[model samples]
Target: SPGIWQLDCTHLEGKVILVAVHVASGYIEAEVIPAETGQETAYFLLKLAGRWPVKTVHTDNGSNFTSAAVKAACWWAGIKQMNKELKKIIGQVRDQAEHLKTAVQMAVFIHNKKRKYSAGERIVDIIATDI
Candidate 1:
């Protein structure tokens, strides 16, 4: 399942906004403040990290991700960095809030039931026991 459905930008009062989506299940996480520095990105990272058991994350080469705090969180979470192959000029995801919420719940159940990533590997194999 995909993480973050999509990114939505709205022109509210003449300003651009970005929405992050969990693609698989429709979980809508948000970052509304201007994300100009590592501090801003760290704040966003904390918000998502607190609620999600994320083991892997993918991001583009954006300055927002060039921060120490965000790096620390990823290290703590055991999050592996995945490469994105977005062909579009600007990477995008669409937010379908209700659908995403429903998808998230179902994905969790399915993922835990029989999550064998490789021929002989499962999430349990990494954690040292069945979940």
Candidate 2:
């Protein structure tokens, strides 16, 4: 399924977190950016250039997604732009930018490894083991 990638942002200590999840495959890409501006967001998406398919980016023409940066980036990058905003917030992001990047790596890895929500385990227990 090379379509319908859902991206959204979250905040932590003043940094913006860009997260795109491949819903069907459960694979996700998360990154840290300085602002929620178009250029930065577009650049962030480019950083993930071939990492995921961008056939249709379902952002609701939000602030950053509406700008020329995203428009051109999506234009060049091959996104169909059938838009929305804020389907989900990525996380309770960490306090440090550098640390957050590492955290992002681990989080995506963890998320991709499990395809289904485990009702068999308690959230706190899973968090405890994961930590």
Candidate 3:
């Protein structure tokens, strides 16, 4: 199945956004963290578990994702970050954390609402059907 996915992290305006997307569905889950660290990855993984059955994950070589702690967390979840293959949105420019956070939320909302060609449905709706 194309349910496997990848993770990436990017920082904007002093906040780190950890993004996870399902390869099949284009469903996205983004978390805003104070920094990109293993602990934050751990938190996001745990949170992701609540909404999705993350059987496999793929991430880059960043320590925040590849550290022992995160490795252990993934192991506990019975999910492994696969070694494999590998966008942006504009919004109101803001220097404040809250504004940036809200902007990210809105962006994700819009993304998940958009239709994906392969799925022939909105990402969020695909996730719902998968669930």
Q: What is the C-alpha lDDT of each candidate?
A: 0.42, 0.59, 0.66
Off by over 4 Å in 2: 82-98, 115-131
Q: Is candidate 1 or candidate 2 better by lDDT?
A: 2
Q: Candidate 1: deviation at residue 129, Å?
A: 17
Estimate candidate 3's alpha-carbon lDDT, on a 0 to 1 scale: 0.66
Clashes found in each candidate (C-alpha, N, C closer than 3 A): 16, 4, 0
Q: Give me the displacement of residue 9 in model 3, in angstroms.
A: 0.4
Worst 10 residues of 2 by lDDT: 82-91
Q: Name the lDDT value of residue 131 in candidate 1.
A: 34
| Model 2 Cα lDDT, one tens digit per residue, 11-130 | 655667787755444456777777778888788777655664457776543665888888898888887760112211224323333576665665555555553552113332433454
Candidate scoring better on TM-score of 1 and 2: 2
User: What are the runs in model 3 whose C-alpha is more than 4 Å off?
Assistant: 82-98, 116-131
Q: What tens-digit string does per-residue lDDT give for candidate 3 at 13-125?
A: 67788888777776677877888888888878877866667788876645556677788878888777610110244243232225777767666766665553433254455
Give Cα distance to truth, residue 89, candidate 1, Å.
23
Name the best candidate (by lDDT): 3
Off by over 4 Å in 1: 2-18, 82-131
